[PDB]
Amino acid sequence: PAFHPGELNVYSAPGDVADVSRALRLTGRRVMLVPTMGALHEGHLALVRAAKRVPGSVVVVSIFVNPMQFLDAYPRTPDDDLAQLRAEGVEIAFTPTTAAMYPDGLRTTVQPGPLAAELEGGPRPTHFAGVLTVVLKLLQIVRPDRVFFGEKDYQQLVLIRQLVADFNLDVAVVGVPTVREADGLAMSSRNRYLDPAQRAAAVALSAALTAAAHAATAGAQAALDAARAVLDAAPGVAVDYLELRDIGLGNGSGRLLVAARLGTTRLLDNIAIEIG
Amino acid sequence: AIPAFHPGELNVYSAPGDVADVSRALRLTGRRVMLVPTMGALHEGHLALVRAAKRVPGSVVVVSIFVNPPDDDLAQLRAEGVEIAFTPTTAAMYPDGLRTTVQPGPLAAELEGGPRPTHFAGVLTVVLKLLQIVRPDRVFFGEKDYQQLVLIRQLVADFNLDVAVVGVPTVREADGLAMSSRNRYLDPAQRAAAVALSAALTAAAHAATAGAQAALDAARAVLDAAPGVAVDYLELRDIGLGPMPLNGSGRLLVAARLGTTRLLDNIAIEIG
Ligand SMILES: Nc1ncnc2c1ncn2[C@@H]1O[C@H](CSSCc2cccc([N+](=O)[O-])c2)[C@@H](O)[C@H]1O
Ligand SMILES: Nc1ncnc2c1ncn2[C@@H]1O[C@H](CSSCc2cccc([N+](=O)[O-])c2)[C@@H](O)[C@H]1O
């Protein structure tokens, strides 16, 4: 497969991107991987820009809607995605087919640890097995020096660090802070599914979290009650969970995580919390 | 700084990071890294794996010795001209206990997975780890554990691992008995009866010109002629351990208990 530096090169075949990545590493370029499900927004572009700033980097952005972590409802805009990558000066997009990634269906897979059964995994007990299986595959195909994930999906980031540690993967996991709208709303491809009213109410998630982070000088109870009060004051926000955990998602430094529904649209957000 | 490596000597590393660093450094110097996973207690069967790895031009041979949850073994490797032994502790391999693991496909529940339903999840997890630590160009496994070999091929294909899996033919005693450290536990009567596994398989392989049923019936007759041999299974499958096709290549696998000693063997079969 051909590779043209300073241009966007799109490969669909795992063998092609593997070959190009290997070649590029051999010539001294450091391979950065940004796994995505497409429908790219500024949150994804922050990942790309973090990748870019690593000197000598070549940036691979994968776009794959992984059926195993689910599907028909997921936003798909491939045209726009590659345009954005071109604008960002990304040199490699990897856009594999389902058949190329899963020629044998679900055969060997990744079994995450107990964290996958909790929070996002509570009602979706196979979700993270899906995510970790695909991320492992992407990591083996691309063999990046570093792989970039958003903090917005904090439990996912934690589990990917677990995958990496547990399987001795020779990749550094880089967590990138959540990119937010002007009012604080965490950027998400799911935000498009909010009407004007729901969009207005949705600010309560980030407002609750930031209120909690500042309340936290008064202790964990204060922080949680501050967040709960903001969410309770929000018209038509239905809370699935609001949980304060250790940073590894098992007191002093923690992470406060929220998941809520606005209509049918389920939103997530989380924030660093320092107690005292 | 990259850990010390002395060419032509047995270099022993216990730290995963150390062997990772040396393997990476060596491959950059134009060596091809060969991995031979073992559980120690080495015999000629394991040496055959080592010798296969050694004959690859440019090879550096990494033999791991690890029991999934010594000086004699090292002497044998030294004598084989192996340059790297990797001897990690359980704590070094599992610093966070069992957390993320590999879930094999359904083949792992069959055959050997009958009595041991989680056995292969353990093997694939540790093999995946060793692969990621050492990043070998090729990894060597004996055909004696054929189902394990097939499952490792599935692991490598399924997770897109960039390693060649090399199956090495089973090394046998003079009478055909597959070499295994367990053979030592057999008393004379049991050791004599144990020959029936290999004899049954080789009979089947030659009977196979007359078809699959002839091959199975020949093997069963041989096993039926042996006292104190409790057959756990005797199965003819295709080479990937799916159902046997009407003709073509297959594999015949047997497992049996002699007292408390469980023995396995298997053989290539060509049907008709
Ligand atoms: N507002 C935001 N700010 C920062 N990062 C954000 C973000 N919104 C999303 N992201 C970040 O953009 C990425 C979204 S997809 S990457 C995870 C994944 C899961 C399953 C399958 C596959 N896959 O097939 O490659 C990949 C996440 O890293 C998210 O945390
Ligand atoms: N007679 C024989 N002939 C050829 N190969 C033989 C053999 N006897 C044994 N072997 C071969 O010697 C190797 C034995 S150990 S490698 C598999 C394993 C299992 C569990 C845990 C771990 N682990 O913690 O790294 C590794 C196999 O490749 C076997 O097929």
Swiss-Prot record, chain A:
UniProt-listed CDD domains: PanC (cd00560)
The EC number(s) this enzyme carries: 6.3.2.1
UniProt GO cellular component terms: cytosol
GO BP annotations, alphabetical order: beta-alanine metabolic process; pantothenate biosynthetic process
Superkingdom of source: Bacteria
Phenotype upon gene inactivation: Simultaneous disruption of panD and panC gives a mutant unable to grow in the absence of panothenate. The double mutant has a highly attenuated disease response in BALB/c and SCID mice; immunocompromised BALB/c SCID mice survive on average 36 weeks as opposed to 5 weeks for mice infected with wild-type bacteria, while immunocompetent BALB/c mice survive indefinitely. In wild-type mice bacteria grow for 3 weeks then undergo a steady decline, bacteria persist over 8 months in SCID mice.
Biotechnological and industrial applications of this entry: Subcutaneous immunization with the double panD and panC bacterial disruption mutant protects mice for over a year against subsequent virulent M.tuberculosis (strain Erdman) infections; mice show mild lung inflammation and fibrosis despite a chronic bacterila infection. This is a promising attenuated vaccine strain.
Pathway(s): Cofactor biosynthesis; (R)-pantothenate biosynthesis; (R)-pantothenate from (R)-pantoate and beta-alanine: step 1/1
Record: residues binding ATP: 37-44, 150-153, 179, 187-190
Swiss-Prot/TrEMBL keywords: Acetylation, ATP-binding, Cytoplasm, Ligase, Magnesium, Metal-binding, Nucleotide-binding, Pantothenate biosynthesis, Virulence
EC class: ligase
Binding sites annotated in the UniProt record for beta-alanine: 69
Result for mutant: residue 44 to A: More than 1000-fold reduction in activity and 60-fold decrease in adenylate formation. 10-fold decrease in the affinity for ATP
Membership in a protein family: Belongs to the pantothenate synthetase family.
Function (record text): Catalyzes the condensation of pantoate with beta-alanine in an ATP-dependent reaction via a pantoyl-adenylate intermediate.
NCBIfam families cross-referenced by the UniProt entry: panC
Protein name in UniProt: Pantothenate synthetase
Organism name: Mycobacterium tuberculosis (strain ATCC 25618 / H37Rv)
Swiss-Prot record, chain B:
Activity regulation behaviour: Pantothenate exhibits uncompetitive inhibition toward both D-pantoate and ATP, and non-competitive inhibition toward beta-alanine. AMPCPP exhibits competitive inhibition toward ATP, uncompetitive inhibition toward beta-alanine, and non-competitive inhibition toward D-pantoate. The enzyme is most active in the presence of magnesium or manganese. Other divalent cations (cobalt, nickel, zinc) are less effective.
GO molecular function (one): pantoate-beta-alanine ligase activity
Name of the featured protein: Pantothenate synthetase
Gene3D superfamilies: HUPs (3.40.50.620), Pantoate-beta-alanine ligase, C-terminal domain (3.30.1300.10)
Its EC number(s): 6.3.2.1
Misc: The reaction proceeds by a bi uni uni bi ping pong mechanism. Was identified as a high-confidence drug target.
UniProt KW keywords: Acetylation, ATP-binding, Cytoplasm, Ligase, Magnesium, Metal-binding, Nucleotide-binding, Pantothenate biosynthesis, Virulence
Entry binding sites for Mg(2+): 72-73, 76
Binding site for (R)-pantoate: 148
Stored InterPro entries: Pantoate_ligase (IPR003721), Pantoate_ligase_C (IPR042176), Rossmann-like_a/b/a_fold (IPR014729)
Annotated ATP binding sites: 39-46, 142-145, 171, 179-182
Phenotype for residue 43 to A: More than 1000-fold reduction in activity and 52-fold decrease in adenylate formation
